[PDB]
Subunit: 134 residues, 3 copies
């Protein structure tokens, strides 16, 4: 384990609405367990096939979070107030975290855009590659 | 070659329809040749500018596949049955594979959503970073 | 610094139009400074929440560029000539570069699709992982 790669994957999540970032169940990396105590992690949240349902330009915010909270966030939104059929909108988020700050874990989170119901019904991943500062 | 990075890129592919996952020609990493026999690979399939044509909510499924078959898959779809003009829908898929299972290669694949013709006419990549278990 | 991870992030950029690739201010990795003189870099440009405004199927081209120019590029475009409201269209681009060619830096760049104004008003990143040839 000189060069550890962390990964977690899901294929579904209970459909929820949330005004605040809530964990995506199963997208969680236990960093402490891996013996990562310092250095840097490049974390990728990959949700390649999500959709959102709602009545007001639906979408989903996603975030990468540690113990210390959200490090990076982003969203997709549809370009129609009520899309003919809510299409799949691939989403990727990349963030680099300093593990020494007190990071024990990394997780993926999501939140509604304008009261959207959030849908994962296929593969989604959270991955991390360990490195050093330059 | 202590820390090998694998990469393959294309700029086009013959436009095809397929009911089943078929290789995207040229998105192929010969892992065995690189002397990767165990450990983990973080594989990224990046198709940043695809489009699909069809008459029924067109889209494309994409997959990361090894010798042992599809490890991860996802899709984009338009939100209109027949879009005014089929726009570019960036797509990224990330998967982590155990090389020891008998992985000699990693490839990108695609399949039609609802009989869509699949279009790559610009840069697309398949990349991999080698690591260990934690 | 045996295994260096490079990263840069922004949360906004002045809104501009450009017929040619122009730097996205702040998405810049000083590679030379990190003492990377050879080997390979896997570079990810992550713009998870952009939008474009215009009157003719708006969109944005993005590129990864070194001192030696653009190594990889891609775009998103809307599927309507004038979208009801220009939605957020997550964009990721992945490229692997040979550092020995005279690479001192890596940057993210963008260009208008059909005279689109280019909008970043939230987190965007440029990341790189160092490896060797196989
Ligand atoms: C209630 C309903 O029928 N929804 C369908 C959807 O119906 C379309 C209408 O809403 C539209 O305005 O009129 C057209 C006329 O053609 C449609 O009848 O059709 C989509 C497919 O276009 C369908 O979703 C597919 O469902 C199948 C199983 O039947 C698959 O699981 C397939 O992957 C689904 O398509 C994807 O998911 C949807 C949300 C979009 O993102 C597509 O672009 C993807 O390809 C709708 O079906 C519903 O949603 C499904 C996920 C499922 O939960 C069904 O139980 C539900 O009816
Ligand atoms: C048959 C045709 O003319 N298709 C065009 C498309 O026409 C539009 C109509 O379908 C629409 O409903 O009405 C409007 C009125 O303005 C249009 O006339 O226009 C697009 C550009 O908007 C055009 O695609 C561009 O073609 C050029 C070369 O002319 C470039 O290669 C450019 O990158 C193309 O745009 C992209 O690709 C298309 C598919 C979309 O994803 C855009 O959002 C991208 O920016 C259509 O042209 C066709 O498709 C091209 C790929 C090419 O194969 C042409 O030979 C073909 O006419
Ligand atoms: C001028 C204007 O009002 N633009 C709004 C937009 O208005 C819609 C109309 O253009 C449409 O055709 O009719 C509907 C009727 O409901 C709307 O009134 O609404 C969007 C939200 O739907 C709004 O953008 C949001 O603005 C807030 C602050 O008020 C937030 O910053 C929010 O994140 C914005 O939404 C996102 O950004 C826009 C561009 C889209 O990508 C959405 O899908 C995202 O969720 C428009 O507001 C404008 O753009 C904002 C970025 C901001 O600069 C405002 O000052 C400007 O009015």
């Amino acid at each position: 384990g000189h060069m550890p790669l962390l990964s977690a994957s899901i294929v579904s999540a209970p459909v929820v609405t949330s005004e605040t970032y809530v964990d995506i169940p199963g997208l969680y990396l236990d960093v402490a367990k891996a013996g990562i105590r310092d250095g840097k992690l490049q974390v990728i949240l990959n949700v390649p096939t999500p959709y959102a349902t709602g009545n007001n330009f639906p979408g989903i915010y996603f975030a990468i979070a540690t113990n210390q909270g959200v490090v990076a966030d982003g969203c997709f939104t549809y370009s129609s107030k009520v899309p003919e059929s809510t299409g799949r909108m691939p989403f990727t988020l990349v963030a680099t975290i300093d593990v020494g700050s007190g990071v024990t874990f990394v997780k993926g989170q999501w939140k509604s855009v304008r009261g959207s119901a959030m849908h994962i019904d296929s593969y989604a991943s959270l991955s991390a590659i360990w490195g050093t500062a330059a």
